[PDB]
Design an enzyme around this catalytic site. Structure first.
Site, PDB file in Angstrom:
ATOM      1  N   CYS A   1      -0.174   4.037   2.508  1.00 25.87           N
ATOM      2  CA  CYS A   1       0.095   3.654   3.888  1.00 25.87           C
ATOM      3  C   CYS A   1       1.475   4.141   4.321  1.00 25.87           C
ATOM      4  O   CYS A   1       1.618   4.761   5.370  1.00 25.87           O
ATOM      5  CB  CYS A   1      -0.030   2.138   4.070  1.00 25.87           C
ATOM      6  SG  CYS A   1      -1.649   1.421   3.628  1.00 25.87           S
TER       7      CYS A   1
ATOM      8  N   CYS B   1       0.819  -1.224   0.000  1.00 25.95           N
ATOM      9  CA  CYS B   1       0.000   0.000   0.000  1.00 25.95           C
ATOM     10  C   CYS B   1       0.860   1.286   0.000  1.00 25.95           C
ATOM     11  O   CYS B   1       1.394   1.696   1.026  1.00 25.95           O
ATOM     12  CB  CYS B   1      -0.952  -0.053   1.206  1.00 25.95           C
ATOM     13  SG  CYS B   1      -1.935   1.402   1.574  1.00 25.95           S
TER      14      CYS B   1
END
Length: 105
Positions: free
Chosen positions: A34, A31
């Protein structure tokens, strides 16, 4: 000032025993966002050192918490008061993350 959680029992016990607001960063190495909001998460953890506990959870390392906590998109920040969920933010929005931490702290 962030604590990396690596198992479910340890996670549940922290929420269970917390006398503070707990903020949890559900993260993944796949991700991109993230990892981009991760420095902001850390800053805030230092900017609320007394009354808020900050946790970090890799959803591929602790599978039993990603499905059990109803994570549907990444990143996800969940907020717990007295071991009970009170709020949630999905996405790497720095402004909303600050604003939601302030709301509950």
């Amino acid at each position: 000032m962030v604590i990396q959680v690596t198992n479910k029992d340890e996670f549940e016990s922290i929420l269970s025993e917390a006398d503070k607001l707990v903020v949890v960063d559900f993260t993944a190495t796949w991700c991109g966002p993230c990892k981009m909001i991760a420095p902001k998460f850390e800053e805030l953890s230092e900017e609320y050192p007394d009354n808020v506990v900050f946790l970090k959870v890799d959803v591929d390392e602790v599978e039993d918490v990603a499905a059990e906590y109803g994570i549907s998109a990444m990143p996800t920040f969940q907020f717990f008061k007295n071991g009970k969920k009170v709020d949630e933010l999905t996405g790497a929005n720095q402004e909303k993350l600050k604003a939601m931490i302030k709301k509950h702290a």
